[PDB]
Design a binder for this molecule. Structure first.
Ligand SMILES: [Mg+2]
Ligand SMILES: [Mg+2]
Ligand SMILES: [Mg+2]
Ligand SMILES: [Mg+2]
Ligand SMILES: [Mg+2]
Ligand SMILES: [Mg+2]
Ligand SMILES: [Mg+2]
Lengths: 387, 322, 220, 101, 176, 43, 158, 117
RNA sequence: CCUCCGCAUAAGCCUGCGUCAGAUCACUGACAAUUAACAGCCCAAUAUCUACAAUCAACCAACAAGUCAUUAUUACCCUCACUGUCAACCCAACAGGCAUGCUCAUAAGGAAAGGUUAAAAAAAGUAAAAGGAAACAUCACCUCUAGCAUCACCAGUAUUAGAGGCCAGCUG
RNA sequence: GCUACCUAAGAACAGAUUUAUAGGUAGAGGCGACAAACCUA
RNA sequence: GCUAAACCUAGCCCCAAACCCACUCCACCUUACUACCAAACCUUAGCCAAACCAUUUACAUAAAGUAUAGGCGAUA
């Protein structure tokens, strides 16, 4: 069953005038006139090409004359790719073992009560109430309006602790920074083209989390392979690509080392947003991508097991559900299914409030409900990492 | 329906007109590692960040200069939080609307079924600063309330529609950047950047090279009156209950490369003809000329990096409520 | 008239397609079918009725996974988003098909019968005779034209050399070739028949206005 | 110029140049109160804002800074003895703000 | 400056200004092309002067000081433009032999009549110009009847005019 | 009597020169207006 | 296109009838053009081809009015220009076959100045004559140079 | 409902009033976001001479004589422009004398025109 | 004293209570105006992507199943033009109608009475003793037809599609 | 451009709703919760 | 004695003779009057007459309203 009916297809030209069949004679057409005439023959025009070049009427060459048409298909992962099997597929493409819960090295930063902004419930209540209610002139702010403002204001609350820690004066957050990283995985080449908001750069790299006992203990782990799903579903099969490793930056850049990828889901529609398992998969591929490009910038394109492993953490959100991720990239020999594996610590479904009421009901007042500040304790644990 | 005062305005000599609409005296003047972080932001946006899509010239100040100014404010509010703890608890709104609606004057309707009737001429400013800093407490005033100053406000000789100023009817908004339930109603500082139309390259190409600095000055008066005035409305004051204390805010506005600095001291919400009879009091806008932050940027670093411009940014960010 | 049919997309797409009501009208704007028009809006999910299609640079039988068993407005049965290899596609659901179920689309005609599960698709030479089938082709490579509505089923009656004979739910028997693919089991959404519309609102919401044995057929 | 076919510009082509200007211009007095630096003209219909800027710059050496035009509808409401509408012709009005103070 | 829209400030209100003749054509055929360029701008600025003076004359409800020199300046712009077009045309006849500066063709629209079609500039050639090919430069056979009807309406108007001229001639011979 | 409920899109799309010339019968409408002598052949 | 009386008496309803011929997609081989054409044809045309002893004779013998097809007249102009030129493009590298085919139809030799105009409709001949006598006009520089060198050669002979 | 009135740009709905304009010429083109790009080359430059020391006023004195109208035919312009060069080079390749066969290499082509006025 | 009106945009109309002048219950001529930021006027190809409604979107709650999205490579550097902008207004009638946003009695808009008398009859309103009436469609059901694909039915497939039938009380 | 049904993409206050805009169906016709109603008095 | 009355001459009609028109510049089939981008032919039917209607029914001179045709009738 073919798609597209004949009435919507390009209508075939009527068959040629029978004069074009007689071999001896030149037809007499309306091409001597400069207009259609129905009692002369329809001429056959040579395929015209505009000699000069104009940009608004450019017609690019077909997909062989492009100077990088590699026949071996690269599967690309851009920020819009909504994966199918959720986290398992990114764990396969990443060659990593998952560990539920953040490590004690990160959560112990907020173990003492000294690492606290004063009245953190009042401040985070004001960030939630500001962005989700008090923000704009509209009566309720839409998600595209408030979600970067929730993330941005929480980063300003954690940025207000330069008074307690001077080291946070060595980190910036850049935006519209696009990294890229290609790696081989069993049979076919993969690329992540990373274009997400708020890569928080530092001067200093993050100190590693997993010891060599745990990295070595990843060898007996096996990746849970899956089926019928070939594990490249919903990536973008591109033939016209370029293998390239980009940290997003020119060389010689202060604040060069990625710290946290603050990637968010600010689409107003439920179908237009990433489902939260796919959100977590997008975080694993972006932190893997930027950490991997950091490894290619520090160590060449050498498939090896890294001695100074790179650790890049990321926070992804829908606006009220937070998903935390610490990624520990310790091998670049991705193509085998054995050896040491990367390892990642996740926090799933860490909502910082159940719901927000932007109008009073008649009973329940204006404001959030279900607020739980342990999630901001996790957020602020991730901001204080390496300080 | 009301006049629609645009702060970042193409109109010639719109500064003198806005001092009429606003009842302001424009007084010229004012009442280390920061250089490293500033040059890090400059070189970050011009040089170090790799662009996927090619930055054309029209696309520039949307792509290039806007996150430059965002990064400057977020890093200076970062680093200057120990020197000024009021910025540690101060809200930082990025591209957030400020509206103010006031009534200034009277007009008898010249044509129509309403002819010969007093219709007071309303105005609204809708503005988006690039980013503003709002404190829960209020900066102390620069000059005393009801400070006399001998220079006189302009008086236009014609209808404000003879400046290209146009009328619409839409929702009258008085808005500081957030609704009135927010605890941070008062305002510290406000950072603007002039749009692609108001480049000084065009203003030199067109023969209005005089009005270049006027553009800065107009964005001074319309924005800050719409901000301080809106702050005065959130504290309950209005045109008949005039402000009992002066409301003060502050603005560095720029072209991306040239910076100018402004202070604004709202003393009167009494702008109507009913309320400008026993009203000697007036609003005062302090201002500087424009000075370039850097001079050029080549391949690797900046050249001709001025330092007093960073010191006036910092001295704006460093004052405090009491 | 300006009738351009919406039935115009060329490539198969997993996404819903905005479709345009005809109103009962022709391409000439006159009512040919009375009593159509004015329903709730619907989007069209493109169904792949060629059930066995090997994908690009693959062949032979292949497994596929059910991701979601989805209501479809355009038809009576509900459908299944079903992904295998590098491609998702919408197929039509059988009665017990869960999310997460695995379904084998097979091509090899065995020597013996294949004790197939509830929702898989086999050539009619590979089935135990006297089983309920659905989504039956008419040529090898035609695509599944019949036994397609909600809860319907037809039983494979008997087969001759290179030929199977089906009982359609109107009990008219059909002679098709052996190597035409049909899916086993009965179509989902049973008790679509046992239902009370209750008010005429649901008659109007489905796009409906008010108004004004045969011989065993062959295809060999 | 007006009532002249313009040559088509293709990207990379020469500058379009007018050597004898077809369209005239007349500066009228403002019928309302206007600012001191605004000079009001009656542009003919086809003259754009940019043509007027270069027209006053080239021919009259006037430092023009802003130009704002309005098209004025002349009335088609006055009739002959024949009950046939006479149209007073429509005209474009240029409002010119002069530079340099 | 803007004072070139106004004449000599001594002439303001004098209600009569001595102006010379207009340029005739043969006086202008002796001038070079650079000189006709410069004279075009002399007459151009003078014409803007006189048009401001007309519009202010209608504004103040007064009559013009001398409306004749507007007729003289339009007279000279017409003669000068005609001279410049003569030299363009004679050079066109020598260099190419054409007679029209703009190309065209005798075509025959939907309405049957033969029209000089003036060509327009386009970028793409005519056979893939989507809007050009919606124009019909052929008349179908249901038009030839209306061509005959139009032909006979013109022949009636001509016959009426010729006959009416002869009747006026007979009245002249009866009167004289 | 408020049968005429005006719009310019329906007026030009109903009776304009382009719809009149789109058909042969409408071209004959134009030709009869041109032959009666009329000042407006269409909208 | 006519009418019948309903049962072959004039005292019944006069009701109208169209008599359509019987059409047949057949296929022919013109030896002069040397090509197989797929032509819709009727039984009477096949019979006239048989009575003319070939489609080349059927086309070169039948009068333009009698033949009454634009396509058959274009076949006639093709064959007649092929015979009017004695074309080597009939059978290249076989000159005996060319001369045998060309001598078989020697009867219908028409000059080339007449064989172009065979079967053109009047508007198509208006076009062909329009393209014959279209010329870029002569730039009057060349005409005036010719007259002036003529005049200086009259002064040279004085 | 008017037919006699001219269809001007002031007259339709918003979509009609925006499209139709007066007789002005396009200077550039619209781009995405409805952003008009102005092309510098399509704007006419008024080539305006220097009037300094120029001795021709707009009127002619009445003391000047009357002459006879002799329009410039191509025979005259050939005679004075070309004829001395051909008489000189004939008493002692027509492109030598100021003739060009084509003018596709030429900036100011005479047929069809590329200059304005 | 009314205000169930207003003010704007839309559509429509096309200078239609601006100034000067004049003729006429007591329009003509001249001149002048509506200034773009609002709104129209857009988009470089070729491929390839777009399963998870909206409802304060959170649970719940569903069915009639829903209004919103890119990436890959190539090309790409100039820039703010054009048009709308007025009014007491439109379609009718010689009563009515009109989309939307705000205001929900008005900050905006207006005037039911030319003067008199206070007859009849008529219209409307208020008061009144005592009395207190003196067929089609369609859920559902049945029947018949129809084994099928690229312009309806239908991008549907017999659980489908189509055609049929069905007292007391008050009151001029 | 009314009116009847339809379509596209909307809106409003709860639908077998009301409605603006643009398109479609044309007289041997259309359209009809069929009044042999309506289809510019 | 008000209202009015009057008025000749615009033009037109019928012949004859003769074969007409149609690019100042610009714009004009897109929503005509807008500077500029990827397909034509296919019997006229009926009114009316026949006192209805149903086949039928007109579209130089002279032969001649003759031969003919025709519900052998109206009529042609
Ligand atoms: Mg305008
Ligand atoms: Mg705009
Ligand atoms: Mg208005
Ligand atoms: Mg009022
Ligand atoms: Mg009265
Ligand atoms: Mg009573
Ligand atoms: Mg009869």
């Amino acid at each position: 069953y073919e798609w597209g009916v004949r009435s919507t297809r390009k209508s075939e030209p009527p068959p040629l005038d029978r004069v074009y069949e007689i071999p001896g004679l030149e037809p007499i057409t309306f091409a001597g006139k400069m207009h259609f005439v129905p009692w002369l023959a329809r001429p056959i025009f040579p395929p015209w090409d505009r000699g000069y070049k104009d940009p608004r009427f450019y017609r690019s060459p077909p997909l062989h004359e492009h100077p990088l048409y590699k026949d071996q298909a690269c599967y690309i992962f851009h920020h819009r790719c909504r994966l199918l099997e959720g986290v398992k597929q990114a764990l396969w493409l990443t060659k990593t073992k998952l560990i539920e819960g953040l490590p004690e090295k990160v959560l112990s930063l907020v173990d003492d009560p000294r690492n606290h902004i004063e009245n953190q419930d009042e401040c985070v209540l004001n960030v939630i109430s500001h962005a989700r209610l008090w923000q704009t002139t509209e009566e309720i702010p839409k998600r595209e309006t408030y979600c970067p403002v929730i993330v941005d204001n929480l980063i300003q609350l954690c940025k207000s602790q330069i008074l307690k820690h001077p080291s946070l004066a060595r980190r910036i957050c850049v935006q519209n920074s696009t990294f890229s990283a290609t790696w081989n995985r069993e049979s076919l080449l993969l690329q992540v083209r990373g274009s997400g908001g708020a890569r928080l750069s530092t001067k200093d790299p993050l100190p590693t989390i997993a010891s060599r006992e745990e990295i070595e203990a990843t060898k007996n782990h096996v990746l849970e392979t899956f089926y019928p799903i070939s594990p490249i579903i919903d990536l973008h099969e591109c033939n016209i690509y370029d293998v390239k490793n980009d940290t997003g930056f020119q060389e010689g850049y202060p604040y060069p080392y990625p710290h946290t990828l603050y990637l968010l889901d600010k689409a107003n529609l439920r179908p237009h947003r990433l489902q939260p398992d796919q959100l977590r998969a997008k975080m694993i591929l972006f932190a893997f991508g930027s950490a991997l490009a950091q490894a290619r910038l520090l160590y060449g394109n050498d498939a090896k097991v890294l001695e100074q492993p790179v650790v890049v953490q990321s926070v992804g959100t829908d606006g009220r559900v937070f998903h935390f991720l610490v990624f520990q990239l310790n091998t670049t020999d991705l193509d085998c299914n054995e050896g040491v594996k990367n390892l990642a610590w996740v926090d799933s479904d860490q909502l910082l409030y159940q719901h927000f009421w932007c109008l009073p009901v008649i009973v329940e007042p204006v404001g959030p409900v279900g607020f739980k500040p342990e999630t901001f304790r996790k957020f602020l644990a991730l901001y204080l990492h390496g300080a | 329906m009301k006049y629609m005062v645009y702060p970042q305005t193409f109109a010639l000599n719109a500064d003198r007109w806005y001092q009429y609409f606003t009842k302001t005296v424009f007084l010229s003047g004012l009442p280390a590692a920061l250089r490293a972080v500033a040059c890090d932001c400059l070189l970050q946006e011009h040089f170090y960040l790799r662009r996927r899509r090619r930055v054309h010239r029209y696309e520039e100040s949307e792509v290039i200069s806007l996150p430059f100014l965002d990064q400057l404010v977020s890093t200076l509010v970062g680093l200057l939080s120990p020197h000024n703890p009021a910025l540690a608890a101060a809200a930082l709104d990025y591209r957030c609307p400020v509206h103010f609606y006031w009534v200034r004057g009277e007009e008898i309707i010249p044509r129509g079924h309403r002819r010969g009737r007093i219709d007071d001429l309303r105005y609204q400013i809708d503005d988006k600063p690039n980013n503003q800093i709002r404190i829960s407490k209020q900066l102390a005033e620069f000059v005393p309330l009801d400070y006399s100053v001998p220079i006189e406000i302009p008086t236009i000789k014609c209808k404000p529609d003879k400046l290209p100023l146009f009328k619409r009817q839409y929702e009258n908004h008085i808005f500081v950047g957030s609704k009135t339930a927010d605890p941070c109603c008062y305002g510290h500082t406000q950072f603007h950047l002039l749009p692609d139309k108001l480049r000084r390259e065009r203003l030199l190409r067109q023969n209005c090279a005089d009005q270049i600095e006027v553009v800065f000055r107009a964005n001074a008066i319309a924005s800050l009156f719409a901000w301080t005035g809106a702050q005065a409305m959130y504290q309950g004051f209005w045109s008949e209950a005039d402000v009992t204390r002066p409301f003060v805010s502050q603005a560095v506005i720029t072209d991306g490369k040239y910076f100018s600095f402004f202070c604004y001291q709202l003393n009167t919400l009494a702008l109507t003809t009913q309320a400008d009879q026993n009203n000697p009091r007036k609003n005062i806008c302090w201002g500087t000329q424009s000075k370039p932050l850097y001079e050029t940027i080549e391949d690797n670093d900046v050249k001709g990096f001025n330092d007093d411009v960073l010191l006036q940014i910092v001295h704006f960010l460093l004052n405090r409520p009491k | 008239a300006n009738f351009v049919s919406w039935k115009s997309r060329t490539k198969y797409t997993i996404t819903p397609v905005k479709m345009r009501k005809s109103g009962g009208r022709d391409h000439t704007g006159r009512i040919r079918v009375h009593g159509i028009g004015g329903g709730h809006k619907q989007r069209y999910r493109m169904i792949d009725f060629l059930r066995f299609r090997p994908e690009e640079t693959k062949s032979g039988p292949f497994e596929e996974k059910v991701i979601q068993v989805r209501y479809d407005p355009c038809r009576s049965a509900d459908i299944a988003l079903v992904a295998g290899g590098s491609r998702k596609r919408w197929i039509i659901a059988t009665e017990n098909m869960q999310a997460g179920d695995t379904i084998l689309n097979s091509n090899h005609i065995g020597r013996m019968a294949v004790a197939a599960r509830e929702g898989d698709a086999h050539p009619l030479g590979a089935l135990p005779v006297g089983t309920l089938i659905n989504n039956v082709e008419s040529e090898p490579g035609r695509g599944a034209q019949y036994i397609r509505a909600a809860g319907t089923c037809g039983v494979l009656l008997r087969k001759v050399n290179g030929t199977a004979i089906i009982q359609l739910p109107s009990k008219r028997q059909m002679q098709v070739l052996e190597t035409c693919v049909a899916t086993v089991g009965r179509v989902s959404n049973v008790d679509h028949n046992k239902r009370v519309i209750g008010k005429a609102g649901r008659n109007r919401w489905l796009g409906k206005r008010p108004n004004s044995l045969p011989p065993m057929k062959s295809y060999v | 110029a007006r009532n002249v076919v313009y040559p088509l510009y293709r990207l990379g082509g020469p500058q379009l140049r007018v050597f004898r200007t077809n369209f005239f211009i007349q500066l009228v007095r403002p019928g309302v109160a206007q600012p001191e630096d605004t000079v009001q003209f009656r542009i003919p219909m086809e003259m754009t804002r940019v043509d007027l800027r270069n027209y006053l710059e080239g021919i009259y050496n006037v430092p023009v800074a802003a130009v704002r035009t309005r098209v004025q509808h002349g009335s088609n409401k006055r009739r002959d003895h024949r009950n046939v509408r006479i149209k007073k012709p429509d005209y474009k009005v240029a409002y010119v703000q002069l530079a340099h103070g | 400056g803007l004072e070139e829209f106004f004449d000599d400030p001594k002439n303001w209100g004098q209600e009569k200004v001595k102006s010379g003749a207009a340029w005739t054509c043969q006086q202008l055929r002796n001038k070079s092309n650079e000189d006709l360029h410069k004279l075009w701008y002399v007459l151009l600025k003078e014409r803007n002067m006189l048009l401001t003076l007309e519009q202010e004359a209608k504004r103040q409800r007064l009559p013009m000081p001398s409306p004749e020199r507007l007729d003289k300046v339009v007279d000279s712009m017409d003669a000068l433009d005609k001279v410049v077009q003569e030299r363009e045309d004679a050079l066109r006849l020598l260099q190419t032999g054409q007679e029209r500066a703009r190309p065209g063709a005798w075509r025959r629209d939907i309405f049957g009549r033969i029209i000089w079609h003036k060509f327009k500039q386009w970028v793409i050639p005519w056979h893939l110009n989507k809007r050009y090919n919606r124009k019909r430069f052929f008349a179908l056979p249901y038009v030839d009847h209306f061509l005959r009807l139009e032909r006979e309406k013109r022949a009636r108007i001509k016959a009426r005019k010729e006959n009416l001229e002869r009747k006026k001639a007979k009245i002249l011979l009866k009167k004289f | 009597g408020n049968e005429y409920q005006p719009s310019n899109i329906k007026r030009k799309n109903k009776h304009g020169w382009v719809r009149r010339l789109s058909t042969p019968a409408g071209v004959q409408v134009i030709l009869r207006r041109m032959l009666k002598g009329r000042k407006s052949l269409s909208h | 296109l006519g009418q019948i009386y309903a049962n072959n008496d004039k005292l019944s309803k006069r009701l109208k009838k169209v008599w359509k011929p019987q059409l047949f997609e057949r296929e022919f081989y013109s030896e002069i053009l040397d090509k197989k054409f797929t032509v819709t044809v009727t039984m009477r045309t096949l019979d006239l081809i048989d009575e003319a002893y070939g489609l080349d004779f059927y086309i070169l013998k039948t009068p333009k009015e009698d033949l009454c097809s634009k396509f058959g007249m274009d076949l006639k102009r093709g064959m007649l220009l092929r015979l009017a030129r004695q074309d080597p493009q009939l059978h290249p590298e076989d000159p005996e076959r060319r001369a045998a085919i060309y001598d078989k139809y020697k009867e219908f030799a028409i000059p080339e100045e007449e064989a172009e105009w065979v079967g053109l409709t009047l508007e198509e001949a208006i076009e062909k004559q329009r393209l014959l006598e279209e010329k870029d006009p002569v730039p009057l520089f060349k005409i005036y140079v010719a007259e002036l060198i003529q005049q200086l050669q009259q002064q040279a002979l004085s | 409902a008017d037919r006699m009135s001219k269809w001007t740009s002031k007259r339709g709905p918003r979509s009609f009033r925006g499209r139709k304009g007066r007789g002005a010429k396009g200077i550039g083109f619209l781009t995405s976001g409805w952003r008009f790009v102005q092309i510098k080359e399509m704007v006419p430059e008024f080539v305006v001479p220097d009037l300094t020391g120029f001795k021709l006023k707009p009127y002619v004195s009445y003391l000047a004589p009357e002459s006879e109208e002799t329009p410039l035919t191509a025979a005259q312009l050939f005679s004075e422009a070309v004829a001395p060069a051909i008489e000189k080079d004939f008493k002692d390749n027509l492109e030598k004398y100021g003739f060009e066969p084509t003018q596709e290499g030429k900036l100011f082509q005479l047929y069809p025109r590329n200059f304005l006025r």
